[PDB]
Amino acid sequence: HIDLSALNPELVQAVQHVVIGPSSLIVHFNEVIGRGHFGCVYHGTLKIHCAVKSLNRITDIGEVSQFLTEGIIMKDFSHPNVLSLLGICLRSPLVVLPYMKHGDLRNFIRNETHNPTVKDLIGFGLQVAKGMKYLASKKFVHRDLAARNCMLDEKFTVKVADFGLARDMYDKEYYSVHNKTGAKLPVKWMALESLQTQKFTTKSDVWSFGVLLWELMTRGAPPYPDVNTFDITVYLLQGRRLLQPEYCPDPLYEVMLKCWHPKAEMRPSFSELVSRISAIFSTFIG
Ligand SMILES: COc1cnc2c(NCc3nnc4ccc(-c5cc(C)ns5)nn34)ccnc2c1
């Protein structure tokens, strides 16, 4: 039930634009197209093709008013490199997202079917940087930027995803349980200070982006395979970084090193990353 009175009065008008009427959505529950900890995702028809995420695997949703607020905030986000929210359908509520034909970025670059060039791979990086530039300008911290968490549409447009109501753990292997807090953390993508404090910032998103660039240039290799979970802090503090992939241009590796600056405030902004990477991208043919 929608309690319009419970919402921030500023946001009441926006409800009509986020709520999908049950008769407008057909969801094809017979084939799962994605699996998250909080729920499965299915093909949907809205006639536009969409992805429908269930949240029924969680014991409880929480405050319905908060859920709508989350949806309303997320729907106002509009950028070609950021996954949009189509709306919410109240059957546990269903999250309705544009269908991303080529799935997550990590699986796409690991796929022997497609053959992206070095230029294509850098371009995927550039698109992610533009999405993050948008998100950072909205003061939004992603917290879980990784190749597994970005997706590609039918025209290979890369979109930063896995945020707002779409937030989940879509690949359980890369999340470790913290001793004191219990939080499940993507430790191999996290900035040194975040591992120490569990505080996430746009500058820790920049660190994660550096790892994402490394993923692209290795075509989806796992980072730090010979490191075990939380021993990553010890490993990094020894004076170590991910090595330069064979086909990674030198200036792109320099960008990665800047993203992993020990001082958070010294890391490049996403705007600077867009500029620097667009330059490097332009030097390639094909
Ligand atoms: C082509 O198959 C799919 C699968 N899942 C989604 C999908 N799932 C919800 C979602 N929102 N953000 C993210 C980010 C990552 C992922 C996934 C990652 C993995 C490994 N499987 S799904 N899903 N996801 C949304 C849109 N299109 C899809 C297309």
Side-chain angles (χ1 to χ4, degrees):
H1 181 261
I2 303 168
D3 185 6
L4 289 170
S5 166
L7 286 166
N8 187 338
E10 306 266 309
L11 305 172
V12 174
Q13 53 142 330
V15 173
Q16 63 184 296
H17 303 296
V18 302
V19 170
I20 293 173
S23 57
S24 305
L25 173 76
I26 301 164
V27 31
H28 300 262
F29 286 110
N30 194 56
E31 62 167 309
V32 179
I33 61 168
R35 302 192 172 270
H37 193 249
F38 299 137
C40 295
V41 22
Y42 310 93
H43 287 292
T45 306
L46 185 74
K47 182 194 175 177
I48 73 98
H49 197 196
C50 61
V52 176
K53 166 139 202 226
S54 180
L55 286 164
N56 73 332
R57 211 167 176 272
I58 332 167
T59 306
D60 199 19
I61 183 182
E63 195 167 21
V64 178
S65 188
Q66 189 58 50
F67 188 85
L68 276 172
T69 304
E70 282 277 291
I72 286 167
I73 298 305
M74 197 193 337
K75 221 226 167 183
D76 292 352
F77 281 9
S78 194
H79 193 273
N81 304 116
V82 175
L83 187 70
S84 70
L85 172 70
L86 295 182
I88 308 157
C89 194
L90 303 161
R91 51 173 183 177
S92 195
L94 297 165
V95 181
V96 183
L97 309 155
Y99 180 75
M100 299 284 121
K101 181 182 157 184
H102 292 290
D104 72 285
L105 178 55
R106 198 211 177 197
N107 277 307
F108 183 88
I109 64 177
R110 290 177 62 76
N111 190 335
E112 289 179 56
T113 287
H114 285 84
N115 216 20
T117 64
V118 172
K119 193 179 165 77
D120 289 324
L121 292 170
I122 297 175
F124 295 153
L126 181 51
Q127 286 176 71
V128 173
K130 286 171 175 192
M132 289 305 299
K133 178 180 176 166
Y134 179 81
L135 288 173
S137 76
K138 298 283 200 187
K139 311 290 195 176
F140 182 78
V141 182
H142 192 286
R143 297 176 171 243
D144 197 12
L145 184 61
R148 60 174 178 273
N149 285 330
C150 296
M151 301 187 87
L152 286 76
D153 74 8
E154 78 282 352
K155 293 180 290 182
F156 309 99
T157 301
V158 181
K159 290 167 194 296
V160 176
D162 177 50
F163 71 92
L165 302 184
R167 184 190 64 82
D168 213 331
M169 291 174 287
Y170 292 103
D171 195 337
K172 200 172 72 168
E173 194 201 326
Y174 300 104
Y175 299 84
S176 290
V177 185
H178 192 269
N179 299 344
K180 292 183 171 188
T181 63
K184 277 161 268 166
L185 303 156
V187 296
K188 291 188 175 177
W189 281 259
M190 288 166 66
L192 274 160
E193 70 278 4
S194 295
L195 295 159
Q196 279 143 199
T197 67
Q198 265 164 109
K199 170 178 146 72
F200 298 83
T201 65
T202 289
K203 290 304 203 200
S204 70
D205 283 345
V206 172
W207 181 296
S208 292
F209 177 72
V211 180
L212 186 148
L213 289 178
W214 186 92
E215 294 187 85
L216 290 166
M217 301 317 296
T218 57
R219 282 194 70 180
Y224 323 99
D226 287 315
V227 180
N228 272 35
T229 71
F230 280 97
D231 204 45
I232 190 62
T233 292
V234 168
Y235 184 89
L236 292 167
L237 286 178
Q238 285 166 6
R240 300 179 188 271
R241 295 294 186 260
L242 293 157
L243 304 185
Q244 181 176 356
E246 193 172 38
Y247 301 106
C248 175
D250 296 349
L252 193 62
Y253 190 58
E254 294 166 0
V255 165
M256 297 181 194
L257 296 181
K258 291 169 182 288
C259 290
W260 308 321
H261 203 294
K263 291 176 169 178
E265 73 275 8
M266 292 297 143
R267 293 165 204 156
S269 66
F270 282 111
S271 184
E272 193 186 312
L273 291 162
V274 172
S275 175
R276 286 180 179 272
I277 292 164
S278 73
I280 298 155
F281 176 82
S282 74
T283 70
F284 287 85
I285 297 155

